[PDB]
Amino acid sequence: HLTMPYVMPGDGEVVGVGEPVAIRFDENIADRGAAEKAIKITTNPPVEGAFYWLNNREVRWRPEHFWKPGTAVDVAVNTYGVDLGEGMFGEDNVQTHFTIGDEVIATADDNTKILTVRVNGEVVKSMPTSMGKDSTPTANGIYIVGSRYKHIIMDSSTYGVPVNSPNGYRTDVDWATQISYSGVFVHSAPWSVGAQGHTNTSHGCLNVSPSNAQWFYDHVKRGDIVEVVNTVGGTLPGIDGLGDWNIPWDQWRAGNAKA
């Protein structure tokens, strides 16, 4: 009747200013408040933060604004012997210490069709891009950078969409940096270099040149921020998995332990 927790990011990691603390449980948490009270997060310099649940098995913690570069964060998930509701007990404790790296913010502006990467406020890269076509647009909002892949087969069936359906797809891509659980990547797109900076052609992904995609893979890390603006889409859902910052601070801080 035992549940075991997992803490992200990993111990010793350096992450971007958008990286939330994540605690996942292998079982549904009946008493969310019990899990929240068991997790102690220390920051230096100190900054206020709050817990918000993305789903019955994962809780996130983050400040009101992006992390200050250089901040050191310690997370102690002290869940051993904690009753998480309905006789579910935590099986052990876990811990992680990490640090915030430089401020890396990449803005994909659909009005300019340009993805500009700024490091500590300084424009370091400007890449023409091609985003989701009008009928499958890229949602506006703040995306947290996730995993990266040197080569992967982007397959719509991974997300329940048959490849031969209207919005299906199956294509090998290089230098893919994930920014949404829903399947939005920044990746190399040699087939759309002509359209990059002019016309949106994708199912949602941010198409860039092969060299620009390799640069993005090499220089952007998990926790860095990508902000999409001025597209014809809506806003990235706050509970996507990488869209935490699209929940306003009042709602996030209020939390949802009683939901």
From Swiss-Prot:
UniProt keyword Ligase present: no
L,D-TPase catalytic domain ranges (all copies): 104-229
Pathway: Cell wall biogenesis; peptidoglycan biosynthesis
Induction context: Is expressed at a level higher than other LDT paralogs at all phases of growth.
Residues binding substrate: Y169, S182, G183, N207
First-tier enzyme category under EC: transferase
Annotated localization: Cell membrane
Active site: H187, C205
Keyword Signal recorded: yes
Name of the protein in its database record: L,D-transpeptidase 2
Organism per entry: Mycobacterium tuberculosis (strain CDC 1551 / Oshkosh)
Coverage span on the entire protein: 150 to 408 of 408
